[PDB]
Homo-oligomer: A and B are copies of this chain.
Amino acid sequence: PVIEANLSLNQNQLASNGGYISSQLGIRNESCETVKFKYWLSIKGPEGIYFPAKAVVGVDTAQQESDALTDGRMLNVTRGFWVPEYMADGKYTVSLQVVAENGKVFKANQEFVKGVDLNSLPELNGLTIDIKNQFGINSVESTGGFVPFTVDLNNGREGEANVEFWMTAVGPDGLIIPVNAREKWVIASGDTYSKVRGINFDKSYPAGEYTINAQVVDIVSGERVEQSMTVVKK
């Protein structure tokens, strides 16, 4: 409630040769007192890519500086970034992030895609990957909870697909919790491999953000595609 952040991108679909995205950042203080904070814009992408929105002509020497907003006041700022051709095709998340002086974190995220269609299933050349938080459960209590995920791999290819599949939960304190062991499946042409797999968040697991991360590999082509979903343990 101290801060409300908002983000819009000028476009959300880029070709494989990349392009330029401009963004509008809004940070509003809806509180009764002045709020001091730091903020930045960062991008997460495929193949473990993380990069800041900011690019400099020479040596980056800046510090992460605070700003402050009087009660009822807002900041409206504009930022752009190039997405080079060399960066992996796939799904990217742009994240406006604000850390208030009191430690509260506020985020506003938007996605864009590069060389794949927007709102189209991640795929490995006709083998389509549909992994979903089954009941839309975005968080669990500190005392523990369980979250099931549906996994549907549709083989739209003319021939059979040989895939390897696994899942982990990448969490606070460097944790990488197994969710689904490595499995190898042979999927006939026109078949869909379906299963449901859940993770139990034991009471003892640390509070914070967990990325449920599914990886699918075509064992013949060696190509790999990921799907990530977030669950917060309160």
Cα of A175 to Cα of B232 in the assembled complex, Å: 13
Complex formed: what's the CA distance from A202 to B101 in Å?
9
Q: Is A84 an interface residue (CB 8 A)?
A: yes
> What does the 1/0 interface line of A222-234 toward B look like (CB < 8 Å)?
1010100010000
The residue that A177 contacts in the complex, of B42, B100, B167, B178, with Cβ under 8 A, is B42
Residues of B within 8 A of A84 (CB): 164, 217, 219
Chain A contact residues: helix, strand, loop or mixed: strand
For A, the interface residue count at a CB cutoff of 8 angstroms equals: 69
Asked if B100 and A208 make an inter-chain contact with CB atoms under 8 angstroms apart, the answer reads: no
From the candidates B43, B58, B107, B217, name the one contacting A86 in the complex (CB within 8 A): B217
Shortest beta-carbon distance from A64 to chain B in Å: 7
Instruction: State the Cβ distance, A93 to closest chain B Cβ, in Å.
Output: 9
When the two chains form their complex, are residues A51 and B99 in contact, meaning their CB atoms are under 8 A apart?
Answer: no
> Other than the known A40-B177, A56-B200, A100-B204, what 7 A-B pairs have Cβ atoms closer than 8 Å?
A38-B202, A42-B176, A52-B166, A52-B176, A99-B206, A105-B175, A105-B206
Q: 4 shortest A-B CB distances, which residue pairs?
A: A48-B48, A52-B178, A86-B222, A42-B176
* Residue contacts A-B, CB under 8 angstroms, 19 given: A38-B204, A42-B168, A48-B226, A50-B168, A52-B179, A53-B178, A56-B178, A56-B181, A64-B200, A64-B202, A86-B217, A97-B175, A97-B176, A99-B175, A103-B205, A103-B206, A105-B206, A172-B208, A173-B208
